[PDB]
Amino acid sequence: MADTIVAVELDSYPNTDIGDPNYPHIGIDIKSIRSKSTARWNMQTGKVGTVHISYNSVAKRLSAVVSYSGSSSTTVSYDVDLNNVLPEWVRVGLSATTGLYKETNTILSWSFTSKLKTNSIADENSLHFSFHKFSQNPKDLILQGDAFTDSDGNLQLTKVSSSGDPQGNSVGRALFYAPVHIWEKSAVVASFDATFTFLIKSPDREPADGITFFIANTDTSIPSGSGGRLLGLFPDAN
Amino acid sequence: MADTIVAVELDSYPNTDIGDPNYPHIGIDIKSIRSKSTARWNMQTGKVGTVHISYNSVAKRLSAVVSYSGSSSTTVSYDVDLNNVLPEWVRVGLSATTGLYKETNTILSWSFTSKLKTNSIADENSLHFSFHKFSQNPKDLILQGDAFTDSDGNLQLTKVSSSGDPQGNSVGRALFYAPVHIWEKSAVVASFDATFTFLIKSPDREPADGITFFIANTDTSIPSGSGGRLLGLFPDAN
Amino acid sequence: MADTIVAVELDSYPNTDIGDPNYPHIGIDIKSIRSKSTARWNMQTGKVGTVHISYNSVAKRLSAVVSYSGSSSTTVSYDVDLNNVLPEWVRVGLSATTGLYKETNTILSWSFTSKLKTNSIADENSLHFSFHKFSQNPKDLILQGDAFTDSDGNLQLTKVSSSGDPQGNSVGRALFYAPVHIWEKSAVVASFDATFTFLIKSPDREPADGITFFIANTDTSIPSGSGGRLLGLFPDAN
Amino acid sequence: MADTIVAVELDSYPNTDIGDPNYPHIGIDIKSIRSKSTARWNMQTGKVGTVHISYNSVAKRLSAVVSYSGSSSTTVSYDVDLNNVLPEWVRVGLSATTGLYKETNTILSWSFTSKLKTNSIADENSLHFSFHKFSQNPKDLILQGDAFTDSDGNLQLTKVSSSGDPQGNSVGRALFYAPVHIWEKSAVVASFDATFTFLIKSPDREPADGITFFIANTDTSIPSGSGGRLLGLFPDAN
Numbered sequence: 001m002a003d004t005i006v007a008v009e010l011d012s013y014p015n016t017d018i019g020d021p022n023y024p025h026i027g028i029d030i031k032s033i034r035s036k037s038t039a040r041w042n043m044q045t046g047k048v049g050t051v052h053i054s055y056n057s058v059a060k061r062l063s064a065v066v067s068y069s070g071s072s073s074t075t076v077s078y079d080v081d082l083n084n085v086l087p088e089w090v091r092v093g094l095s096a097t098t099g100l101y102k103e104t105n106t107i108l109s110w111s112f113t114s115k116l117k118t119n120s121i122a123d124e125n126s127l128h129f130s131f132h133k134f135s136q137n138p139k140d141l142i143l144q145g146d147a148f149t150d151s152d153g154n155l156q157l158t159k160v161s162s163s164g165d166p167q168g169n170s171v172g173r174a175l176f177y178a179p180v181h182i183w184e185k186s187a188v189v190a191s192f193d194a195t196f197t198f199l200i201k202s203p204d205r206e207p208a209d210g211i212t213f214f215i216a217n218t219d220t221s222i223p224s225g226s227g228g229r230l231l232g233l234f235p236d237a238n
Numbered sequence: 239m240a241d242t243i244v245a246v247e248l249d250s251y252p253n254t255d256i257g258d259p260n261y262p263h264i265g266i267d268i269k270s271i272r273s274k275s276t277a278r279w280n281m282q283t284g285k286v287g288t289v290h291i292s293y294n295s296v297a298k299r300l301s302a303v304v305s306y307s308g309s310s311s312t313t314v315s316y317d318v319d320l321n322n323v324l325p326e327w328v329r330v331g332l333s334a335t336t337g338l339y340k341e342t343n344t345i346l347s348w349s350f351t352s353k354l355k356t357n358s359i360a361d362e363n364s365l366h367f368s369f370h371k372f373s374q375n376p377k378d379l380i381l382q383g384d385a386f387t388d389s390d391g392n393l394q395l396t397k398v399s400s401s402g403d404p405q406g407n408s409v410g411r412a413l414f415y416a417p418v419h420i421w422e423k424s425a426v427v428a429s430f431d432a433t434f435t436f437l438i439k440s441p442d443r444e445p446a447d448g449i450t451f452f453i454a455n456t457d458t459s460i461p462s463g464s465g466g467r468l469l470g471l472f473p474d475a476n
Numbered sequence: 477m478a479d480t481i482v483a484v485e486l487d488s489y490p491n492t493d494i495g496d497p498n499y500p501h502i503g504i505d506i507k508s509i510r511s512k513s514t515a516r517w518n519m520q521t522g523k524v525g526t527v528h529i530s531y532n533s534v535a536k537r538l539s540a541v542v543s544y545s546g547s548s549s550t551t552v553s554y555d556v557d558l559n560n561v562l563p564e565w566v567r568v569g570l571s572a573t574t575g576l577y578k579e580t581n582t583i584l585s586w587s588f589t590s591k592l593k594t595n596s597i598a599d600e601n602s603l604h605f606s607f608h609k610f611s612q613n614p615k616d617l618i619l620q621g622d623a624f625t626d627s628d629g630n631l632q633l634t635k636v637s638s639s640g641d642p643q644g645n646s647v648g649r650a651l652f653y654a655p656v657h658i659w660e661k662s663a664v665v666a667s668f669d670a671t672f673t674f675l676i677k678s679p680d681r682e683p684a685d686g687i688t689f690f691i692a693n694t695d696t697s698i699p700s701g702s703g704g705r706l707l708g709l710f711p712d713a714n
Numbered sequence: 715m716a717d718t719i720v721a722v723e724l725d726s727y728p729n730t731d732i733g734d735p736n737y738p739h740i741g742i743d744i745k746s747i748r749s750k751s752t753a754r755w756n757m758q759t760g761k762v763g764t765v766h767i768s769y770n771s772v773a774k775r776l777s778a779v780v781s782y783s784g785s786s787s788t789t790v791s792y793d794v795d796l797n798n799v800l801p802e803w804v805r806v807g808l809s810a811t812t813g814l815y816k817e818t819n820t821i822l823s824w825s826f827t828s829k830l831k832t833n834s835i836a837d838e839n840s841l842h843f844s845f846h847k848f849s850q851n852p853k854d855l856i857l858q859g860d861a862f863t864d865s866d867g868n869l870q871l872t873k874v875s876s877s878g879d880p881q882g883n884s885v886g887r888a889l890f891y892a893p894v895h896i897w898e899k900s901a902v903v904a905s906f907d908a909t910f911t912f913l914i915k916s917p918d919r920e921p922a923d924g925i926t927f928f929i930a931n932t933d934t935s936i937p938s939g940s941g942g943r944l945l946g947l948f949p950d951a952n
């Protein structure tokens with residue numbers, strides 16, 4: 001069967017033939033590339049941006065905010081019970097693609113916290129990780145497809161040359177090595193927060209295709225046919 | 239000039255004359271004792287209970303859950319922008335009352351985290367405290383009214399005897415000593431999370447009146463007339 | 477080549493033939509079962525104990541303390557630079573054995589934090605995990621030898637029957653799934669802290685053999701001949 | 715009665731007068747301006763530096779490292795039992811002075827964590843704060859002497875002009891608002907960690923006088939005569 005995917009997308013390229021709004025946008029994706037909720041994103045190609053993502057099983061609202069130094073922020077939210085969508089054990093990761101058009105999909109930092117609180121207090125679990133730059137040989141990441149860490153310590157999700165020039169038709173993903181426990185039958189509340197900073201540079205008039213933070217089944221792998229507009233996440237546009 | 243109050247109430251006594259539902263309930267109170275959202279609380283007098291509260295400014299949803307070991311939990315949420323309600327600097331606290339009827343309002347643990355973020359993975363401001371014991375001299379709490387720490391290390395918000403028998407017509411509150419910064423001009427996202435565990439015992443067959451977590455202006459005090467049904471928060475029932 | 481091991485041992489059985497003092501002891505082991513430092517441990521068989529372990533690269537002192545409710549604590553320290561000992565990437569874990577004599581090697585909770593700092597604030601890493609009780613399918617743990625999680629949610633490092641009776645000649649370990657990055661060429665300061673709570677029960681007049689927290693090369697596995705007095709860590713007593 | 719002081723000094727100006735070494739140095743001060751331990755400071759006037767300080771009560775080792783974007787590292791350590799020196803409740807803070815000679819004493823960030831542990835994985839008391847910008851009205855800091863926050867959001871501990879030139883004969887301190895519980899009768903282990911980033915700039919051939927992180931009785935205030943060489947911390951040079 002296909003993987004089960006929940007994602008927040010920073011979608012730089014409007015694919016209106018598969019339901020994208022006709023502008024760069026942020027979106028919340030629940031098992032489909034066709035986002036349940038979107039907000040218009042005013043990209044600053046060449047500038048370092050920041051994304052903050054949060055979810056709590058009591059509120060049942062997955063939210064995301066994108067900002068840049070000295071600019072107005074873009075926000076997006078969706079009401080959803082993640083226990084009905086995802087398995088109890090997941091992996092978390094970042095993905096990016098290029099297609100006919102291209103961009104650098106550079107990650108400068110990534111942090112993530114999750115918590116599982118139950119009935120009994122001494123029945124609980126937490127996981128936190130934080131990367132400010134990345135090791136050249138990162139043993140706590142599963143790197144998939146074209147993803148790699150360059151000589152500056154930056155995570156490049158898609159291909160770039162030695163001079164830093166991006167390449168088209170590229171796909172890559174980075175997953176945290178340990179599975180994450182996001183629900184159980186006795187749980188009272190589960191929550192997570194994620195942050196990443198990113199640098200999209202591009203020589204193209206319309207940069208493409210984007211970067212996601214995603215949560216999937218533990219054995220998730222890049223699907224066949226998921227390049228370009230499908231963001232390395234989905235086998236089709238349904 | 240009255241305080242500005244946001245609270246989560248565990249209201250054990252139905253004051254139907256001032257808009258309570260006719261059962262013990264959990265509520266979200268925005269500037270009034272008359273809750274904007276309530277849910278049925280299945281009290282278990284004599285068992286240790288746990289409350290988890292959370293908010294973030296992108297989701298704009300204040301939510302709370304109450305539970306006991308081996309039991310079903312109760313949730314309540316309300317969509318609100320706290321920027322629009324509270325001043326930028328606050329104190330946070332726990333309050334409790336008894337009236338004609340009575341209960342012990344015993345706090346066994348209390349923790350709190352607030353974050354103010356912008357454009358990096360590290361937060362521009364964060365505060366975290368956690369008490370699992372309470373000290374015989376809590377120099378980091380402002381104790382108001384009948385609130386005191388006992389010989390067992392527990393925090394008693396209202397009057398109780400040597401023998402563990404609660405008293406009627408009591409009011410008590412405990413505030414964390416340092417002001418918390420909950421928004422600013424430059425802010426991208428602000429969030430907070432709080433947890434407390436409580437023991438409510440009663441000789442009566444109808445215990446009263448309840449316990450809250452609340453957030454207020456920094457100079458907040460127990461208002462004249464806030465006994466019983468007003469939970470030590472409000473000077474009247476409007 | 478053999479594994480590289482740094483460990484804190486709760487050594488319940490004196491094997492004076494390989495240099496144990498003639499009493500139960502807590503020990504710091506650096507690449508040998510023969511401890512670099514020991515202290516007398518006053519065991520309370522059948523009671524839940526707590527161990528706290530810490531280290532940072534400026535102080536260069538690895539310390540551990542073992543305690544029980546109502547008792548006084550025993551401490552042990554050793555001055556060592558852990559980088560000259562350990563590789564840059566490690567796994568962290570828990571190990572236990574039994575031999576001719578036996579005990580339960582039960583883990584009720586385990587937490588770990590590591591941090592690696594430079595000065596970019598944006599060149600760095602942290603990892604934190606916390607388990608209060610353990611899942612029936614612990615996908616974030618690598619279980620080795622006889623280790624398993626039971627119906628109560630406890631981690632059993634060595635064999636116990638369904639009635640909870642321990643078995644002799646057992647060895648088991650549990651490793652956190654993700655590698656930990658503990659040094660790099662640009663590092664200024666690296667630190668770690670670990671906590672575990674444990675329950676050692678035994679029908680034997682002299683219980684054996686003990687429990688350790690350990691740090692090893694990422695590919696560590698139970699050496700042949702590490703049963704009993706070698707605590708699942710070393711292939712010989714050198 | 716005088717304040718009770720424990721400090722880590724970054725001392726830019728040798729006062730051989732009162733027992734400084736005859737070079738710029740970092741030091742550990744236990745109840746006297748006359749450091750119990752010093753190290754020659756690998757100083758870089760005009761560069762952003764970072765200080766990390768740590769202590770735990772099992773190891774009994776107070777340690778500090780000062781570095782500059784990864785280079786030019788200096789360390790200092792002292793074996794000491796702080797339960798014998800400090801009261802159980804304290805305030806923590808930063809101080810700085812100029813005298814005949816001068817430098818900017820600029821704080822760009824500051825964080826602190828304190829923990830008091832016993833018999834579990836969850837701590838019985840913890841406190842954590844973090845500032846990466848400082849507020850125009852920082853209600854959670856007690857600002858003493860010349861200390862103010864500037865339009866950039868930096869904390870200036872001593873007088874600086876509107877353009878950016880430091881003034882002589884100035885003193886300033888910033889204390890965190892809430893008292894900190896550092897030890898108790900039945901504590902198993904107490905620990906704290908602090909980090910700050912600073913910028914010392916000077917038009918002088920020989921900058922003065924330095925910056926400290928310190929720990930004091932909760933009621934601490936700038937003593938009379940503690941200018942220049944006494945770092946705003948001590949009334950005399952005894």
Ligand SMILES: OC[C@H]1O[C@H](Oc2c[nH]c3ccc(Br)c(Cl)c23)[C@@H](O)[C@@H](O)[C@@H]1O
Pocket residue numbers: 013015098099100101102208209227228229230
């Ligand atoms: O990278 C931008 C887009 O490039 C391709 O789609 C096209 C967008 N504009 C075009 C113009 C001509 C042709 Br042929 C193609 Cl395939 C496209 C495809 O690779 C899409 O998946 C992708 O989103």
Ligand SMILES: OC[C@H]1O[C@H](Oc2c[nH]c3ccc(Br)c(Cl)c23)[C@@H](O)[C@@H](O)[C@@H]1O
Pocket residue numbers: 251253336337338339340446447465466467468
């Ligand atoms: O503790 C329960 C309640 O007791 C008091 O109200 C009454 C409850 N039963 C009554 C019966 C008669 C009269 Br008069 C009163 Cl005020 C009450 C008041 O103290 C209320 O504020 C409180 O909610």
Ligand SMILES: OC[C@H]1O[C@H](Oc2c[nH]c3ccc(Br)c(Cl)c23)[C@@H](O)[C@@H](O)[C@@H]1O
Pocket residue numbers: 489491574575576577578684685703704705706
């Ligand atoms: O569990 C206690 C000990 O049992 C064995 O060693 C012995 C301890 N007392 C003995 C008495 C007789 C014989 Br045979 C043996 Cl092997 C032992 C061995 O399994 C040791 O590794 C272990 O430490």
Ligand SMILES: OC[C@H]1O[C@H](Oc2c[nH]c3ccc(Br)c(Cl)c23)[C@@H](O)[C@@H](O)[C@@H]1O
Pocket residue numbers: 727729812813814815816922923941942943944
């Ligand atoms: O700012 C650096 C120093 O300047 C002063 O000490 C002197 C250093 N050189 C001098 C030369 C003359 C005189 Br008068 C004085 Cl007080 C000093 C005093 O203000 C000292 O406390 C301070 O350490």
Ligand SMILES: [Ca+2]
Pocket residue numbers: 011012013014015020209229
């Ligand atoms: Ca698209």
Ligand SMILES: [Ca+2]
Pocket residue numbers: 249250251252253258447467
């Ligand atoms: Ca009521």
Ligand SMILES: [Ca+2]
Pocket residue numbers: 487488489490491496685705
């Ligand atoms: Ca032994």
Ligand SMILES: [Ca+2]
Pocket residue numbers: 725726727728729734923943
């Ligand atoms: Ca000096």
Ligand SMILES: [Mn+2]
Pocket residue numbers: 009011020021025027033035
């Ligand atoms: Mn899209």
Ligand SMILES: [Mn+2]
Pocket residue numbers: 247249258259263265271273
């Ligand atoms: Mn009510």
Ligand SMILES: [Mn+2]
Pocket residue numbers: 485487496497501503509511
């Ligand atoms: Mn031993």
Ligand SMILES: [Mn+2]
Pocket residue numbers: 723725734735739741747749
């Ligand atoms: Mn000095």
